[PDB]
Amino acid sequence: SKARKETYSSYIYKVLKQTHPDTGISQKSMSILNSFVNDIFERIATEASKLAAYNKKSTISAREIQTAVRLILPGELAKHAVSEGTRAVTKYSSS
Amino acid sequence: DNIQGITKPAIRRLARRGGVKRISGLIYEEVRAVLKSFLESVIRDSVTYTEHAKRKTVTSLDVVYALKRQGRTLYGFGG
Amino acid sequence: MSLILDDIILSLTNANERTPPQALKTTLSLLYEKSKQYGLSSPQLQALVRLLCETSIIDTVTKVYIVENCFLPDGYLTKELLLEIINHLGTPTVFSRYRIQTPPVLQSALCKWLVHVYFLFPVHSEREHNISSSIWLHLWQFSFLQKWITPLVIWQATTPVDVKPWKLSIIKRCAMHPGYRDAPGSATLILQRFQCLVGASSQITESIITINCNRKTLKSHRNLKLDAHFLSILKRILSRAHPANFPADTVQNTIDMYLSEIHQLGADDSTVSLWDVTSLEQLAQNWPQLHIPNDVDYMMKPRKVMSRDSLKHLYSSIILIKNSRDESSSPYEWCIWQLKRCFAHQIETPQEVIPIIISVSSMDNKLSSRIIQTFCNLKYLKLDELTLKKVCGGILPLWKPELISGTREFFVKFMASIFMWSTRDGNNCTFSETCFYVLQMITNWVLDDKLIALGLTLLHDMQSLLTLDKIFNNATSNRFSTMAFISSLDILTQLSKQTKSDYAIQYLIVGPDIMNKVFSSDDPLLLSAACRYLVATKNKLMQYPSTNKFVRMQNQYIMDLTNYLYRNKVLSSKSLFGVSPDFFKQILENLYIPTADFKNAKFFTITGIPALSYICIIILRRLETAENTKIKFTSGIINEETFNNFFRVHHDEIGQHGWIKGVNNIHDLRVKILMHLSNTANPYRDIAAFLFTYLKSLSKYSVQ
Amino acid sequence: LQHQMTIMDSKKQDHATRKARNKELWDSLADFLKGYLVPNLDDNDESIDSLTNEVML
């Protein structure tokens, strides 16, 4: 009767259980994590869109997303993020 | 009426949380005035959002949207 | 309502010494509910506040309670009530030992009451306030009520003048006085309030530091505690008694800023030139002190906005409000002097002066009377025709003279001057243009109930001049003359519709032989006005007898017009437009037609009249395109000889399709075009509408 | 103007000259003493005007 809430809750819970199973999650922490993930995604998407629109680039691709995440995330996390993302994209292309 | 309704022990607790050990008298109504200013600033945009939505109630989504528009992002309330 | 509340106060006043067990309490109990419900207006409070001190039968404990609760004023509570309280305030002495002493606690409670409702105090006349301020300062010396008048004294004294050294000495000495326990707290705020009024005041800061305290109590003394329940009911009481006056939001706000002033103490004919006036709100306060520097260059040469130039046009108007208007007024002479220069071209150029002076002269009809009466001269037209034309379009239709009611005789002479000017000149068409504005002015006279006959008499003289050979003609004339005349007929037509004006009917009825000119002239637009006028006239003139000059000329018009339009029986008639029909015959045989089958029938009909000849063809061509018949009408004029020849040539093709459906011959054709001409919305719908009523054959199909 | 005429009139209330008022001010003080203050003084063992003339000076 209620339109389903679009969240990342199952995947966040799965990530926690993959890390370590002993502890759990509270509802307030769950909302905090959901809001944080949504905000980060919105920031990155807006940055990629703006950057693509600047070079009159009609499309958004891996290069644009990598540049946008380098712009947003500070370099310390950005190095690991771009390394893991490149690994994922290359292995997906291989698959 | 209720501006004085915000009682001075609450401001005392706020000062103790901040970390001070000495309290003057002017800071009481100065805190009252700054709270009134912040409240009016948030409420104006919250009411604008609510009226534009054509709903005649104010919701957590609207207030957090107004806060994010101000720049003081609030987490843990959805949306 | 409030009369019973007067009786309740009178009930406690009428009866004394009775000492009842519960009757006194019940009257007080009835006063508890009646005070809040009806407001206890100022005259009631004055009697009540005098009753508490006069009668000591009621204990001072309940005397304070009723002041705290019942005293919720909705009235104006002017100084008369305050003076009575001031009389109650005070202490007994050797001189006043015979007078009964009011309880000090009641005085403190009374002093607590007007502090809550100080915002409701009258806007003073700044004459008894000096007496009141000194009285309150003298009353402030009493200790039991010092704590409550101290916030009051802060309020009414807002000027450096009210900060008087003798007042400073009294306030300071009380704090320096040992036996008060509250003056140093009370004096500090009063001295601080007096400090912000006069300025630096190094003398007032040396007194404060001598009387300073630990200032926790001063912080409590800075805050004034007014009962929220007292103010909440007061806001409701004030709004109910006076709608749209003392709003509850502002009443609470006004108390708050008065309270905030006390909190701020701890942290902290008179000539005014019109040149420096900028704000209309300030002008409202400056209205008793307004003064206009007499400069002629500015007050007419530069609104909802706020500025000095916003009141620009108002400057020329407020002076007429400040002093009565006169012919010797400088703005009234500047326009005439500028007007005098512009005609003589002594000014640099008249084009920019006209719009500003016209707007000024558009109003002030008594002033505009002077302007128009002196510049309406033949000599003033010789200098330039255009400048006289420009001023005729501005002040003529907007003028209604009532000074002497004898200006009609001047216009007929002056109006003929322009006409005579146009005769020997040889046309310019300036006479007809100038007449139209006068006709607009005439309707203004007609609209006014006064001088209705005077305006109509002026209008009649215009038609005689307008219907002359040189100005109006069917061969060589201008559309200006006809367009001026068609507007005049609408004025009389509108005058017939109005029933609130009981005028002379001979004025409405136009001349007998003057209608032959308008009827004979083949201007299609002009003929439309005549049909409208004739139809509207026949609405009236129904109570008149069968034999009368007015009704005989009206029936003559109807018969002649229909004969000239549709009847086509002028020869059988006895006359047409005052001309014997046999005169028409003599012209006809002299005229030559290449094929004259029915010579007489072609000229006199709706299609044969030159005014409605070609427009008849236009309607037919519209019909042929819509119906899309086999054969179009090749001829350029519709008459009997063309119609039958058109049908005779194509008689073989007539039998199968013929022509547009619904028509069998030319007689049916002449109506069918008129049915369309009556169906559509156009200037000549009025022509067909007139012909419908007085055609008796078609009137049968109409209801009743 | 309508708002001003409700406040009206500050000037007319005072009006309804200073030298004339000075004589009235002296007379107002003169009549106040003989009527109220002097009877309350109850001195000279009986007095209405003689005691009043002393306090005027």
Curated annotation (Swiss-Prot), chain A:
The modification N6,N6-dimethyllysine is found at K5. Monoubiquitinated by the RAD6/UBC2-BRE1 complex to form H2BK123ub1. H2BK123ub1 gives a specific tag for epigenetic transcriptional activation and is also prerequisite for H3K4me and H3K79me formation. H2BK123ub1 also modulates the formation of double-strand breaks during meiosis and is a prerequisite for DNA-damage checkpoint activation. Deubiquitination is performed by UBP8 in presence of SGF11. Changing Y54F: Confers UV-radiation sensitivity. GO terms for cellular component: nucleosome; nucleus. It comes from the Eukaryota. The modification N6-succinyllysine is found at K2, K14. The keyword DNA-binding applies. It is found in: Nucleus; Chromosome. One of its GO terms (biological process) is chromatin organization. Belongs to the histone H2B family. Core component of nucleosome. Nucleosomes wrap and compact DNA into chromatin, limiting DNA accessibility to the cellular machineries which require DNA as a template. Histones thereby play a central role in transcription regulation, DNA repair, DNA replication and chromosomal stability. DNA accessibility is regulated via a complex set of post-translational modifications of histones, also called histone code, and nucleosome remodeling. This is Histone H2B.1. It comes from Saccharomyces cerevisiae (strain ATCC 204508 / S288c) (Baker's yeast). The gene is HTB1.
UniProtKB/Swiss-Prot annotation, chain B:
Keywords: Acetylation, Chromosome, DNA-binding, Methylation, Nucleosome core, Nucleus, Phosphoprotein. It comes from the Eukaryota. It is found in: Nucleus; Chromosome. Disulfide bonds: none annotated. Changing K68Q: Mimics acetylation; does not show increased sensitivity to DNA damaging agents. The nucleosome is a histone octamer containing two molecules each of H2A, H2B, H3 and H4 assembled in one H3-H4 heterotetramer and two H2A-H2B heterodimers. The octamer wraps approximately 147 bp of DNA. Histone H4 is a component of the UAF (upstream activation factor) complex which consists of UAF30, RRN5, RRN9, RRN10, and histones H3 and H4. This is Histone H4. The lineage of its organism: Eukaryota, Fungi, Dikarya, Ascomycota, Saccharomycotina.
Swiss-Prot record, chain C:
The modification N-acetylserine is found at S2. Transmembrane segments: none annotated. GO terms for cellular component: kinetochore; nucleus. Keywords: Acetylation, Cell cycle, Cell division, Centromere, Chromosome, Kinetochore, Meiosis, Mitosis, Nucleus. Signal peptide: none annotated. It is found in: Nucleus; Chromosome, Centromere, Kinetochore. GO terms for biological process: attachment of spindle microtubules to kinetochore; cell division; chromosome segregation; DNA replication initiation; establishment of mitotic sister chromatid cohesion; meiotic cell cycle; mitotic spindle assembly checkpoint signaling. Its main location: nucleus. CDD domains: CTF3_NTD_HEAT (cd22647). Component of the heterotrimeric kinetochore subcomplex CTF3, which consists of CTF3, MCM16 and MCM22. The CTF3 subcomplex is part of a larger constitutive centromere-associated network (CCAN) (also known as central kinetochore CTF19 complex in yeast), which is composed of at least AME1, CHL4, CNN1, CTF3, CTF19, IML3, MCM16, MCM21, MCM22, MHF1, MHF2, MIF2, NKP1, NKP2, OKP1 and WIP1. Interacts with CTF19. Interacts with CHL4. Belongs to the CENP-I/CTF3 family. Present with 319 molecules/cell in log phase SD medium. This is Inner kinetochore subunit CTF3.
UniProtKB/Swiss-Prot annotation, chain D:
It is found in: Nucleus; Chromosome, Centromere, Kinetochore. Keywords: Cell cycle, Cell division, Centromere, Chromosome, Kinetochore, Meiosis, Mitosis, Nucleus. It comes from the Eukaryota. GO terms for cellular component: kinetochore; nucleus. One of its GO terms (biological process) is establishment of mitotic sister chromatid cohesion. Transmembrane segments: none annotated. Its main location: nucleus. Present with 1026 molecules/cell in log phase SD medium. Component of the heterotrimeric kinetochore subcomplex CTF3, which consists of CTF3, MCM16 and MCM22. The CTF3 subcomplex is part of a larger constitutive centromere-associated network (CCAN) (also known as central kinetochore CTF19 complex in yeast), which is composed of at least AME1, CHL4, CNN1, CTF3, CTF19, IML3, MCM16, MCM21, MCM22, MHF1, MHF2, MIF2, NKP1, NKP2, OKP1 and WIP1. Interacts with CTF19. Belongs to the CENP-K/MCM22 family. Component of the kinetochore, a multiprotein complex that assembles on centromeric DNA and attaches chromosomes to spindle microtubules, mediating chromosome segregation and sister chromatid segregation during meiosis and mitosis. Component of the inner kinetochore constitutive centromere-associated network (CCAN), which serves as a structural platform for outer kinetochore assembly. This is Inner kinetochore subunit MCM22. The gene is MCM22. The chain holds residues 121 to 180 of 239 of the full protein.
